Structures are given as C-alpha cells and as structure tokens.
C-alpha cells in the first residue's frame, strides 16, 4: 500500500486517541477526587463551546463569585490567561524546552503548567483554546464540553473559526502527524486489491458548502460524553467526503487507507479546519 505513510495522520483513532466532539479520554486526581480531562493528541481546529441561551462567549472568564461568565481561566496575578504568544515566549525565555515549540504547542504546555486547586501532586492539566484573532492563549478553567440535558454544547461556528481546542497532550509535531487542512480534488477510499476503492458504507447528508460538511462530521465524531467507561479512544464518524458539485457530505466511521483523485470532492476530518483547503 503506497498510501500507508501519507494516510497515517488520518488514522484518528491512533494519532488522536480520544474524543473529538467531546474529549474526556483521561482521568486525574485533584485533592482525592477523580475528574475527567481532555487528552486528545491533535488540535481540534474550529472547535468552541456554545452557551445555549446566553450572549456570553465561552472564552469569558468563569464567574468569580455561573451564568454571568464563561469557561476561561479567571484573572490572576501575575496574569496567566489570556497570554499572547510574545508574552508566552518571553515568560518561558529561560526554559530550554520552549525554544523549538510552536504557538499551539506552547499554549497547551502553558495551560498544562497551571496547578489545579493547590494539588501539586496531580496530573490534571487544564485544556486551552488558542485564538489566531490576536495570538492569545486562553486557559480553560471549565474542561467540560457538553451539558444539554447552565446548558452548553460544542460545535463549529463562523465565530469559533480562529479557535483551536487543545488538550494537555497535543504533540509538538502536530504540524506533520495531525490533520489540519482539507484536501482539494481528493476523496477518502479503502485500499482493496491493489487499487483505491470507494468507502463501502457512508451516510450522505446535504451540505451547502464545505463548512456545513465539516460541522456535520464534527457533530457525529467521537464523543466521550457520558450516556473508564464512555471513552471513545478516537472511534467514531470522524471522516467526510464532501461532493462540491452535488453539495453532499458523505460521512463514515472507518479509517481511510488511500485517496481517490476525484475533482468534485474535498476530503475533511472532524479535526480539520472547516474552511482551510490546501
């Protein structure tokens, strides 16, 4: 299979290893109690949290003493969140393990070096969102993504479009081993009998443009939300073939192992940015 090494980054169950819609793939101890915690290894481009029935953006700092505020780290002294890329690099100037890091990886590490509730003996590391609007890293105090039985749900929105949801486990080489941009004139397929064949079982949903297809794939993507139980480990409807000519979004839950050179298709993943195309 000549596509093995190129298609490795679309093996989401391996290169990500956790839920995408809802990432709660690990547990950690904080003052005795065990809590759930995002643990995906790839950035989730275009992901945010919608505060159902609220005009408060989810990157607003949490209520400092619930409806009033959002999910972000409250103001502190010195200020840790939000922190610009220039501020982060200067803050960790003397740290050797930051010099070759990138803006997204640095944000995840910076969020991960924050102590949870005065328990220094805890592997609980807060998630974060990096905003390319102004190159600011927002540490997230609330690491929950969905509550719609204060009601909120995750999604991809035109407003969440410069965001990137970052677990504590984002790899410093996400640039090579993770999906970011969608593929022009390419369709996901399965290598069968020495030739790339179509995906055998997909669900076709109308989608006016690429953004809607990516939003759908995200909604059906792997979800660790309660219904080590309720951990997807990256399994789900994470992939999508978007037919630009027919405006059809073809979603499936099997890892693709090759690409079909079709000029009417754009290949997308739940992790991928909803708009960017190579």
């Amino acid at each position, epitope marked *: 299979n000549p596509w093995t090494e190129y298609m490795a980054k679309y093996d989401i169950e391996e290169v990500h290893g956790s839920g995408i819609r809802v990432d709660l793939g690990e547990d950690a101890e904080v003052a005795g109690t065990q809590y759930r915690l995002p643990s995906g290894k790839c950035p989730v481009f275009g992901k945010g949290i919608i505060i159902e029935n609220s005009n408060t953006a989810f990157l607003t700092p949490v209520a400092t003493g619930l409806k009033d505020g959002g999910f972000a780290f409250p103001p502190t002294e010195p200020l840790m969140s939000p922190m610009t*890329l220039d501020e982060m*690099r200067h803050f960790y100037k003397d740290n050797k393990y930051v010099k070759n890091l990138d803006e997204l990886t640095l944000c995840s590490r910076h969020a991960g070096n924050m102590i949870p509730d005065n328990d220094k003996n805890s592997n609980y590391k807060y998630p974060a969102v990096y905003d390319d*609007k*102004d190159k600011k890293c927002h540490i997230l105090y609330i690491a929950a993504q969905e509550n719609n039985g204060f009601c909120f749900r995750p999604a991809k929105d035109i407003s969440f479009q410069n965001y990137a949801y970052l677990s504590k486990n984002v790899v410093d080489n996400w640039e090579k081993v993770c999906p970011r941009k969608n593929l022009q004139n390419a369709k996901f397929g399965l290598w069968v009998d020495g030739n790339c064949e179509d995906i055998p079982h997909v669900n076709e949903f109308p989608a006016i443009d690429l953004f809607e297809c990516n939003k759908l794939v995200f909604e059906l993507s792997a979800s660790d939300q309660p219904k080590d139980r309720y951990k997807s480990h990256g399994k789900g409807y994470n992939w999508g073939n978007y037919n630009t000519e027919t405006q059809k979004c073809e979603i499936f839950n099997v890892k693709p192992t090759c690409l079909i050179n079709n000029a009417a298709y754009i290949a997308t993943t739940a992790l991928s940015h909803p*708009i960017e195309v190579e």
Partner: antibody
Amino acid sequence: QVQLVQSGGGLVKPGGSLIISCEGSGYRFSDYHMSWIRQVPGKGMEWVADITTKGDQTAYADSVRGRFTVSRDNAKNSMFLQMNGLKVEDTAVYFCGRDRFRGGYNYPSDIYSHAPDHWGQGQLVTVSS
Amino acid sequence: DIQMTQSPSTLSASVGDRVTITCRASQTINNWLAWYQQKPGRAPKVLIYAASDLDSGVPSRFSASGSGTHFSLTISSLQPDDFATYFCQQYNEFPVTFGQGTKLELKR
C-alpha cells in the same frame, strides 16, 4: 520591545529596480505573517503584498503583481521587497507591518488576510527620471 | 474589490469632547476591521482589531463597534495627544483596502 527597522529607500529611475528591507527584533520573526503597505504622499494607504510565516505563499495587489516580489529570510530576522520595472506611479512611502491579527480566508489561494499591529518607520521610494 | 469609505475626512473638536469616525464598506467585511492612528511623519499605531477589540496599552477612552458594512471608532474624552489622523483597514479579503483617513484637529 518590538521594533521594525527598514532600509533601502532612495531614488530610482523609471524601469529600474530596488530592494527594500525590513528587519525585526524583540520577537521571534518566524511567528508572524507580514505585509508591505505604501502610503502615496498626502493620500491614503494602499496594500502592496503579503507573505506567510514560512514564506511559502505570497499575495500581491493587482497594480504590482508580476513586478514586485516579496521574500523573507527568517534566520536573519529580515523581510524583503524586490521592486522591478518601477513606474513613477510607485512613488510612495513603503511600510512593513507585523501581521498579528488574522482575519478572513482566501480560497483557493490558501492565504489569510491580516491586519498589522506594528509598523516600520517607513522608507521613501521616489521614482523619477 | 472592497472599497472602504471613511467619513468625515476632517473633524474639528475641543478637548474633552466625544467624536466618532465612520468607516463603511461596499460589501460585507464581517468583523475584520482594524483602526490605526498616524501622527505626521511617524508610523501608524494600532488601536482596534476585530472592529471592537482594543490592543494592549490603548487608553480606555478609545472604543469601536460595528459589523458587516457599518463601523465606527469613538473617542469618549479627547486629550491633546489624540489629535492626529485615523484610518480603518479591512482584512477580510484580498486586496486589503484602507480608508482615506480622517484628520482630527483641535478647536481653539
């Protein structure tokens, strides 16, 4: 602190070529999209060209495409604008901008449009025989 | 090709006054508008990005709003330093286009 220092401005006869420089300090030069913007003296601003962080992709205004070439050498913390076949209509003050603010997307070009947060001091380029 | 139209081109006002600078686009630019201040002979200084966000260090008297085709920069209580030229930039599409500018000047 963040500084953008330019050099290379001068007088060029029409049809000639000139290279303008933009050297950045106080930050990692490789982290930022960048812009070239010219201000026709007395008039308003006019965008010239953009270059991505890695330098892979470039964007140019219609009035300069094919004549100007933007490039960057992140190892030297430097960006360049190669102007060829200059016209008198190019006479203006050329600024370089550090593009921290990301905005809209351009398909199929694969380049985002940006707004600068820091500007260079400007260099006056005069084209006249 | 988006044409930014900035009005008024000249605005005279006294210290302590509120002024607004309107900048409008021929077609939607969503929220990708930035405001700048330029003193004569000096490089521009960024004031606003995303049409409503202040850069660090900008005084709180500066503020801005807008979306789509309607944008406005407001200075609540002018100080002697604020008198300068202001221009908007649109970074939703290429080509990036600017406003021709507004010269704010003191009234004695």
